[PDB]
């Protein structure tokens, strides 16, 4: 249930958040009406979900990134582990997973004593044990494909 | 250098990516000419890279995402992978990493089975190992923390 005008915005949108609403009228061939309308409905369906600044974060101070995968202490605590981590504001995302670990998360710190002191705020937070990939380089990220 | 009236118009760009060079500089206490200009400086700078809206990814087709490590197989040939992947579009995201693999891709696909293709296709363009970890699930993803 998404036709081909919903397709260019949330295309458009993608490439361009703080684009206007006339702006993405000229685009789709519509009113600058029937395009808030129909971007109000994207937002309320779940196809787009809010929108953001891409922030350099080496700018702000986080020179060291790292994914962290997380496995239960004990596997019978019922799954709590994103809930109980999302206080933790370096943690930037959690996904589940399937194979020998149950979560990956994504970490931003400033250094590599802070990634020490954070390992052992997740550890005892989730009761979970680590293992960290640290990131060397980004190359490219987020990049959205709306196929 | 990033004065922190800079700070929290970056704390306010990256929860409201379409919040307004108007109704910012009342959340935070400078003119509306004041407020538009440091973001022109801010994306000058590269501190915002860039304005996205953050399209769910189900709903436009991609019910299966995967982290995929890969390592180049030959290692007497330059190790220019992210370069060579970069055309592929259902890759998002490359890092390079220190860990057991050289690099981590984050990658979306209709399915199981159009994981396989992608990956033999990832195989025979860059030249590379590949050992891929299937998401089941995102509880959250890109919340960026500003100091
Ligand atoms: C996040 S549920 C844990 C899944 C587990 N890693 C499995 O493969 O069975």
Partial sequence: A???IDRILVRELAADGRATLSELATRAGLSVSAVQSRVRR???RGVVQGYSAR???????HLLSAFVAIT?????????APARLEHIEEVESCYSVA??????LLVRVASARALEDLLQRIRTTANVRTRSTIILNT????????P
Same sequence: chains 1, 2.
Avoid: K, W
Avoid at 55 to 61: K, Q, S, Y
Avoid at 72 to 80: A, E, K, R, Y
């Fill in 42 to 44: 994207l937002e309320s």
């Fill in 99 to 104: 194979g020998e670990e149950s979560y990956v």
């Fill in 139 to 146: 190359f490219y990220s987020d990049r959205q494909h709306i």
């Fill in 2 to 4: 998404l036709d081909d």
């Fill in 55 to 61: 922030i350099n974060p080496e700018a702000v101070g």
């Fill in 72 to 80: 239960p202490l004990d596997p019978s605590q019922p799954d709590d």
